[PDB]
Amino acid sequence: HPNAATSDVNVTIDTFVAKLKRRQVQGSYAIALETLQLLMRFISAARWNHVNDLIEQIRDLGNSLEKAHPTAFSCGNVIRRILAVLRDEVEEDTMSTTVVAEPLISSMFNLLQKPKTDYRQVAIQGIKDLIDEIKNIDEGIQQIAIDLIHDHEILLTPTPDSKTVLKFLITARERSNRTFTVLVTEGFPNNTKNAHEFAKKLAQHNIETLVVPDSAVFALMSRVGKVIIGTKAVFVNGGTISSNSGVSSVCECAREFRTPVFAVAGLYKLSPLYPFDVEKFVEFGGSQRILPRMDPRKRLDTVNQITDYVPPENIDIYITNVGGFNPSFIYRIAWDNYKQIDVHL
Amino acid sequence: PGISSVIPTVLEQSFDNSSLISVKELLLNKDLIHPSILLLTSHLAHYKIVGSIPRCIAMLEVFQIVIKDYQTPKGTTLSRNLTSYLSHQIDLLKKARPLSVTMGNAIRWLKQEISLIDPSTPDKAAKKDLCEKIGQFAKEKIELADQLIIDNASTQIEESTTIVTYGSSKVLTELLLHNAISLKKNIKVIVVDSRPLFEGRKMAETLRNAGVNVMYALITSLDTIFNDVDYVFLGAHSILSNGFLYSRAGTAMLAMSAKRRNIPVLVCCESLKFSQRVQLDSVTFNELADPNDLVNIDYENPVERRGNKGALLNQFIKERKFEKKKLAMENKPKGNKIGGKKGSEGESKDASNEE
Amino acid sequence: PGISSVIPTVLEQSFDNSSLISVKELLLNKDLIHPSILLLTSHLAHYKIVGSIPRCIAMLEVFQIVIKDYQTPKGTTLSRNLTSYLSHQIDLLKKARPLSVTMGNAIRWLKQEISLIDPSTPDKAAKKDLCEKIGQFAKEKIELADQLIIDNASTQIEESTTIVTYGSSKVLTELLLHNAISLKKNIKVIVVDSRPLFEGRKMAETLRNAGVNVMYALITSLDTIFNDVDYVFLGAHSILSNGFLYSRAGTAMLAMSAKRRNIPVLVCCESLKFSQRVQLDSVTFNELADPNDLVNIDYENPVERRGNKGALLNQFIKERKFEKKKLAMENKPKGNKIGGKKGSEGESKDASNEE
């Protein structure tokens, strides 16, 4: 399937691709927004008559998008959600067209046995719903969040790169009777500047900031109380993709010390496919940013990566806009937002 | 007389015990000081190469030089204000950069020597024999020991190798170089660096100066690094009464990682470095330094950019602090290579009373 | 409403997540308060026997009694001030001592019921069917659930069993008794108990009254009986959607020990004990009583003695605090048996949607 049909009917595909490839598009949220807009454009314009064929077309589009860029998960997720939204309505329609029992909301046994309408507006509304969801995660978190941390305790903070995490911290810091001391690891060849910014913000906020060299984690772990990951994406068996560098080692340390690890994210960040590898998903940075020189630097083959993967085991809770979930449980949440056939396009 | 007071930046809250301040730029002092000590202090303070092994050697050399230059006064005997002078030197050293365990040992040895030949002798006969003795001692307990360690290491490698490394351990540099050159094996070297002082970079440079197959990375960049690769090596500074690894910075995390990922670690040690001072934490007594070790914005050392940060005393409520010497977990590093070839660090003080 | 604040004991620098005191000795009570509630409050204030399960039942009974005593007024309708009354009662309960999740659920159900029946139906006929339905609910969501728990236990628990427990959880007591006299087997049942309460002691007494071989245990040495012990149930109170147990006393320690030594720990529960609220440590939401429970020299409960103890403010600063409810862990209590029969606490809220 090529862009042969999508020409003077829809244009912005190419623009999207450009944004993906050269990185003029920045932050998962923005990508998601872009995808939503694309979907809106698709809907306001494309010509149907049928329904299954339309679904197939949409699937193909999704596939194409994936092929254009994989690290953008939000894009995929939103598409999947909208497909799911459509699907339920389609199912409802079919029941009226033809003219049922199940123990709970969905079934395994309904997959074994043999099983024109106004869906477009519903589809439109789905997109709006998605947009609204995207709008605020934090305004559905800080009620399950300004609860866990207490007085005279000590936080450990890797990945000051997810805009959500900072906000979460600051909401907690707001209270005039609650007090905590904050340790912040750097993350060097991908995060330093961000970390510095975060530190500055903390200082501004009138709270006790502590700047840490990425080495010196072990000389302070005796006093450590909590662990917060600044993840970018979330997956099937619980685990997360993170907004780059200096998270994995610290998590491992925490696990060794048995010092609690929390995950703060969102369900637009939530994805309906397994990270069978880290290799196919997590991408690498630029060897140029570490060291100068070039002709002795054909010999100096240096390795540095942007994104970070963490195994399901070290992390314990995923507090959402919906509420507190677990690595064992998050799969069902995903299923509650994207349907069973939508997993594979 | 000297200079005290006027210290840079905020004093934070925790880890408030050790000297970290001071004479960086000189302004009036006492009037009979030999300047070589002062020069050395100046060097050590603004040093980006030294790492446990060479400092003590340098100190020894300086002392030798002093002895050679030493003139016995026409009035009083060979040790009257000499002790005072030595004390002053010590004070200066401490003000500049703390006396390490090796330095303490050296001081002890000096004191012993002072006691050995008590006041009764002239000049060019006593110090003639002293200087030679000390040279011989240096030859014995240091260089030969290092050689022994090297040769132990040589056998320790069997068939096929892929290694990850850290630290400005002169001995380790020697080791790896030896592997590369006069052993001609299939020796792969991966380097880890650190922000407080650039040791990893130096190591890499040294490797290049041989033409080694080198990968290079840092403290965080590790999770991908293991995706075949087996060996891991470290370079400790000192071991206490406890058997704990009281060394420099970025070691412990790496060690932990290695432990987690199946294949163990090995460190190297010297048969003089052990102490009877007892501690089990980083907080007790540490190499603490000025936060100027964290001002530069990546890439190199001399660049100086007006980007986002560049202030400390004007930053209201901000506590920027870093540590240099750590205390690594006891059970984690397996093999230790001292004078008696091989052994478990559960030994701790097995050579301490042996002296 | 009465008297609030103005009470002894300091704010405590260590642990102050919830308030600590209230109304114990009655004076100037409002001329509408039902005596059953008052009596219950009086009981709970200095209660030995009940914990979690029977409390809820008692509350339900009280509510039923209140309903029976209540008739529709000429001015105000059936749903006009009932809700307000309920709220007041809840506030009184809170003031007395914080409550359980089951209780909350019951309250919610009551509220729902209030909404369900329309204010137009015959008043005598309304409460006739109401009290029946409440009774039915009680039977199903407690007695039936208990029966189901028992039956679950039956299939799982082996021929001849040694069972070690902590607390006063009535279900477990019932189960033990069933095993003793109804189905008939050998039962070596060991119970542990702390200083302030005598729950374990009471349970032991009860068992004796039914004729069982019991071992009476304390904190100072648990291990001495394990090092043999084969099957263990803990003091169930409330589960959170994490997969933990907000429960009584040093059960956590016991669980840890069990994990260390051979066997998993297991727990039975009711399919309405579950919450949807969550927490993860013994600091989160503490359940507290007065530090007066440990002033007397032990043996019994009401004694009144002269010796040394009795200083909360008298001497130079003296804080004698404690906890009642603590955090039980996750990886260890693998077993859960409910109204929906089976499952793991790893599956922390797989019945909360099914309801």
Q: Is residue B270 part of a domain?
A: yes
Bridge partners (DSSP) listed for residue B328: B245
Residue B266: which of B338, B194, B213 has the closest Cα?
A: B338
Those residues whose C-beta lies under 8 Å from the C-beta of residue A154, and which sit 6 or more positions away, are A180, A181, A182, A183, A223, A224, A225, A226
Residues A170 and A125 in one domain: no
Asked if A104 and C354 come within 8 Å (Cβ–Cβ), the reply is yes
How far apart, in whole angstroms, are the C-alpha atoms of residue A198 and residue A192? 10
Residues A143 and A89 in one domain: no
Find the domain containing A195 and state its range: 137-336
How far apart, in whole angstroms, are the C-alpha atoms of residue C298 and residue A69? 71
Residues B193 and B339 in one domain: yes
Q: In this structure, which long-range contacts are made by residues A138-142, counting pairs with CB atoms below 8 Å and at least 24 apart in sequence?
A: A138/A164, A138/A167, A138/A168, A138/A171, A139/A321, A140/A320, A140/A321, A140/A322, A141/A168, A141/A264, A141/A319, A141/A320, A141/A321, A142/A168, A142/A171, A142/A172
Within 8 A of A216 by CB-CB distance, chain B residues are 249-250, 322-323, 326
Within 8 A of C278 by CB-CB distance, chain A residues are 144, 317, 323-324
How far apart, in whole angstroms, are the C-alpha atoms of residue A218 and residue A221? 5
Q: Are C106 and C59 in contact (CB under 8 A)?
A: yes
Q: Is B7 left (phi over 0), alpha (psi -120 to 50) or beta?
A: beta
Question: Which of C276, C279, C348 comes nearest A329 by C-beta?
Answer: C348
Q: Are B92 and B38 in contact (CB under 8 A)?
A: yes
Within 8 A of C279 by CB-CB distance, chain A residues are 147-148
Residues C194 and C123 in one domain: no
Q: Are C161 and C129 in contact (CB under 8 A)?
A: no
Residues C104 and C182 in one domain: no
Residues C140 and C165 in one domain: no
Residue at a domain's end among A97, A114, A135: A135
Residues A122 and A157 in one domain: no
Residues A99 and A194 in one domain: no
Residue B101: which of B285, B251, B252 has the closest Cα?
A: B285
Residues C158 and C130 in one domain: no
* Beta-strand runs (E) in chain A: 153-157, 180-185, 209-212, 226-229, 231-234, 240-242, 261-264, 301-302, 308-310, 317-319, 324-325
Residues making up chain B, counted from first to last: 355
- Identify residues of A whose CB sits under 8 angstroms from chain C CBs: 104-105, 144, 147-148, 150-151, 260, 316-317, 323-326, 328-329
Q: Is residue A81 part of a domain?
A: yes
Q: Are B220 and A246 in contact (CB under 8 A)?
A: yes
Q: Are B42 and B96 in contact (CB under 8 A)?
A: yes
Bridge partners (DSSP) listed for residue C245: C328
| Residue A63 host element (H or E) | helix A52-68
Residue at a domain's end among B148, B182, B215: B148
CB pairs under 8 A between A and C: 37
Asked if B224 and A187 come within 8 Å (Cβ–Cβ), the reply is no
The per-residue DSSP string of C60-126 comes to HHHHHHHHHH----SSS-SSSSHHHHHHHHHHHHHHHS---HHHHHHHHHHHHHHHHS-TTS-HHHH
Asked if A324 and C243 come within 8 Å (Cβ–Cβ), the reply is no
Using the structure block, give the residue that is written with the tokens 């089976």. Answer: C342
Residues B125 and B110 in one domain: yes
Residue A275: which of A243, A305, A231, A310 has the closest Cα?
A: A310
Total structural domains in chain A? Answer: 2
Residue A243, domain CATH: 3.40.50.10470
Q: Is residue B212 part of a domain?
A: yes
Residue at a domain's end among A65, A100, A135: A135
Residues B138 and B194 in one domain: no
Find the domain containing C314 and state its range: 149-355
Those chains having 3 or more beta-carbon pairs within 8 angstroms of chain B are A
Asked if A144 and C279 come within 8 Å (Cβ–Cβ), the reply is no
Q: Are C334 and C264 in contact (CB under 8 A)?
A: yes
- Kindly give the pairing relationship between strand B319-320 and strand A209-212: parallel
Using the structure block, give the residue that is written with the tokens 């910014």. Answer: A197
Question: Which of C16, C17, C242 comes nearest A326 by C-beta?
Answer: C242
Asked if C243 and A326 come within 8 Å (Cβ–Cβ), the reply is yes
Residues A274 and A191 in one domain: yes
Residues A51 and A76 in one domain: yes
DSSP B257: H
CA quadruple A69, A73, A76, A78: dihedral sign: negative
Phi and psi at B335, nearest 5°, equal -90, 140
Residue C49: which of C175, C239, C202, C209 has the closest Cα?
A: C202
Q: Is residue B245 part of a domain?
A: yes
Residues C78 and C154 in one domain: no
Entry resolution in angstroms?
10.4
Phi and psi at C162, nearest 5°, equal -100, 120
Residue at a domain's end among A87, A103, A135: A135
Residues B60 and B165 in one domain: no
Those residues whose C-beta lies under 8 Å from the C-beta of residue B176, and which sit 6 or more positions away, are B165, B187, B189, B207, B212
Within 8 A of A336 by CB-CB distance, chain C residues are none
Mutating which of B11, B207, B221 best tests the A interface, going by the most A Cβ atoms within 10 A?
Answer: B221
Total structural domains in chain C? Answer: 2
Residue type, B252: A
Q: Is B158 exposed, middle or buried (0-12, 13-18, 19+ CB in 10 A)?
A: exposed
CB pairs under 8 A between A and B: 147
Those residues whose C-beta lies under 8 Å from the C-beta of residue C183, and which sit 6 or more positions away, are C154
Residues C355 and C316 in one domain: yes
Which alpha helices (DSSP H) does C197-281 contain, by range? 199-210, 223-226, 251-260
Residue at a domain's end among C148, C177, C209: C148
Residue A80, domain CATH: 1.20.120.420
Q: Is residue C6 part of a domain?
A: no
How far apart, in whole angstroms, are the C-alpha atoms of residue A144 and residue A137? 12
Asked if A324 and C242 come within 8 Å (Cβ–Cβ), the reply is yes
Asked if A211 and B294 come within 8 Å (Cβ–Cβ), the reply is yes
Q: How far apart are the first and last CA of chain C?
A: 37
Question: Which of C242, C276, C346 comes nearest A317 by C-beta?
Answer: C242
Q: Is residue B3 part of a domain?
A: no
Residues A242 and A199 in one domain: yes
Residue type, C168: S
Tokens describing residue B100: 């390490």
Q: Is residue A3 part of a domain?
A: no
Q: Which chain B residue lies closest to A245 (C-alpha atoms)?
A: B220
Residue at a domain's end among C148, C180, C202: C148
Q: Is C168 on the interface with A (CB under 8 A)?
A: no
Asked if A214 and B227 come within 8 Å (Cβ–Cβ), the reply is no
Q: Is residue B75 part of a domain?
A: yes
Tokens describing residue C140: 């199903």
Residue A98: count other Cβ atoms within 10 Å of its Cβ: 6
Q: Is C138 exposed, middle or buried (0-12, 13-18, 19+ CB in 10 A)?
A: middle
Q: Is residue C3 part of a domain?
A: no
How far apart, in whole angstroms, are the C-alpha atoms of residue B133 and residue A219? 41
* Min distance A120 CA to chain C CA atoms (Å): 31
Residues C158 and C94 in one domain: no
Q: Is residue B2 part of a domain?
A: no
Which alpha helices (DSSP H) does chain B contain, by range? 35-45, 53-69, 82-96, 101-116, 126-138, 145-156, 170-182, 200-208, 252-260
How far apart, in whole angstroms, are the C-alpha atoms of residue C205 and residue C203? 5
DSSP helix/strand/coil, A236:
coil
Residues making up chain A, counted from first to last: 345
Residues C108 and C233 in one domain: no
Within 8 A of B194 by CB-CB distance, chain A residues are 213, 215
Question: Which of A150, A151, A324 comes nearest C278 by C-beta?
Answer: A324
